[PDB]
């Protein structure tokens, strides 16, 4: 492991240092359907005409980005995504901008969002959840190892591959930081106490969000939910958690350690690092390696009928794409 990561650190760095720019043009793709949406941008199923391959195009309106103050985060996102390389992260194929927008062309993860399935089935069995969990674990250990923070773990941000494996998308909040950071970033239900507390934070936030994830997947709902955000933040800080009756003691306990309000008591943020987790009872049958190798028994497999089949995503109103005669915010995005 330490071994692997070692080698891993070098790739990243090289890419980190010399990030790629404008590897394609709008024209070289055919707009198909809209796969999903977010607070910032949109994702369309696109098709590379010269190749015949499908991909996922993320469009960001330059002006909209500026208005929501996401100039620095966007740059991070593109910068971070092009350099990482892990079996559970989406692949960014191309990137380019135009007079009005920013584009990131990624591999298309057909399986759909874990969200849709989860909300579908209503809940995942302990073992099925442990499968995903296990994958997220390795992903953070990898990310954290590159001094990176993901800060936006949610089922809406997790895609299912053709093999039942996890593809992590949305690197919009990703940040390379040695030290504390203070931005209020996330998704309400996944926010860690210290974030909502405007107290300065680190990687431990990724760990908290993981407990929230495992909980939701196993329970079928979040540990803290209300109708408006402020009410959530409030429950989240109360420091009280309730577990469903069908949660093995093992589960209950791991979660106890992850949903630890006190960051010096937080699994992942302790002495034994990620080992505290990997070593946890609930994880006693998990073959970390087989998993990394994608050699494990995938509980569920989304089935898709034909390349470019979008049955695993919801339907979205098609906004049309628009490029202006004049450049909008050139300087601000000089490095994309």
């Amino acid at each position: 492991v330490k071994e692997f990561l070692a080698k891993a650190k070098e790739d990243f760095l090289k890419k980190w240092e010399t990030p790629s720019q404008n590897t394609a043009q709008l024209d070289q793709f055919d707009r198909i359907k809209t796969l999903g949406t977010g607070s910032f941008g949109r994702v369309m199923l696109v098709k590379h005409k010269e190749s015949g391959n499908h991909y996922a195009m993320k469009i960001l309106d330059k002006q909209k980005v500026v208005k929501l103050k996401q100039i620095e985060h966007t740059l991070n996102e593109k910068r971070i995504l092009q350099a990482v390389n892990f079996p559970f992260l989406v692949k960014l194929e191309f990137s380019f901008k135009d007079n009005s927008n920013l584009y990131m062309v990624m591999e298309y993860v057909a399986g759909g969002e874990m969200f849709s399935h989860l909300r579908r089935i209503g809940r995942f069995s302990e073992p099925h959840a442990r499968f995903y969990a296990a994958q997220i674990v390795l992903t953070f250990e990898y990310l954290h190892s590159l001094d990176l923070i993901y800060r936006d773990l949610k089922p809406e941000n997790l895609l299912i591959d053709q093999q039942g494996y996890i593809q992590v998308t949305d690197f919009g909040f990703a940040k390379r930081v040695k030290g504390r950071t203070w931005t209020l970033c996330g998704t309400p239900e996944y926010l860690a106490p210290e974030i909502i507390l405007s107290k300065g934070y680190n990687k431990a936030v990724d760990w908290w969000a993981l407990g929230v994830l495992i909980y939701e997947m196993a329970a079928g709902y979040p540990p803290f939910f209300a109708d408006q955000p402020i009410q959530i933040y409030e429950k989240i800080v109360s420091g009280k958690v309730r577990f469903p009756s069908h949660f093995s003691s093992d589960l209950k306990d791991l979660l106890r350690n992850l949903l630890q309000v006190d960051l010096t008591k937080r699994f992942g943020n302790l002495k034994n690092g990620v080992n505290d987790i990997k070593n946890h009872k609930w994880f006693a049958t998990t073959d970390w390696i087989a998993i990394y190798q994608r050699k494990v028994e995938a509980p569920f497999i989304p089935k898709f009928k034909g390349p470019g089949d979008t049955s695993n995503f919801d339907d979205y109103e098609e906004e049309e794409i628009r490029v202006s005669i004049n450049e909008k915010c050139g300087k601000e995005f000089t490095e994309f």
């Binding site: 999903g36 977010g38 607070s39 910032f40 929501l68 103050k69 996401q70 969002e113 969200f115 909300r119 209503g122 936006d152 949610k154 809406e156 949305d170 919009g172 909040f173 209020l184 970033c185 996330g186 998704t187 309400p188 239900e189 926010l191 079928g220 709902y221 979040p222 939910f225 209300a226 109708d227 408006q228 955000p229 309730r242 469903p244």
Partner: peptide, 20 residues
């Protein structure tokens, strides 16, 4: 029940990220 409680809440759909 909790589940019942959740399903009638206003946050069952997809949740967007927070910003300003």
């Amino acid at each position: 029940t909790t589940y019942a409680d959740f399903i009638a809440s206003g946050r069952t759909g997809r949740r967007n990220a927070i910003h300003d």
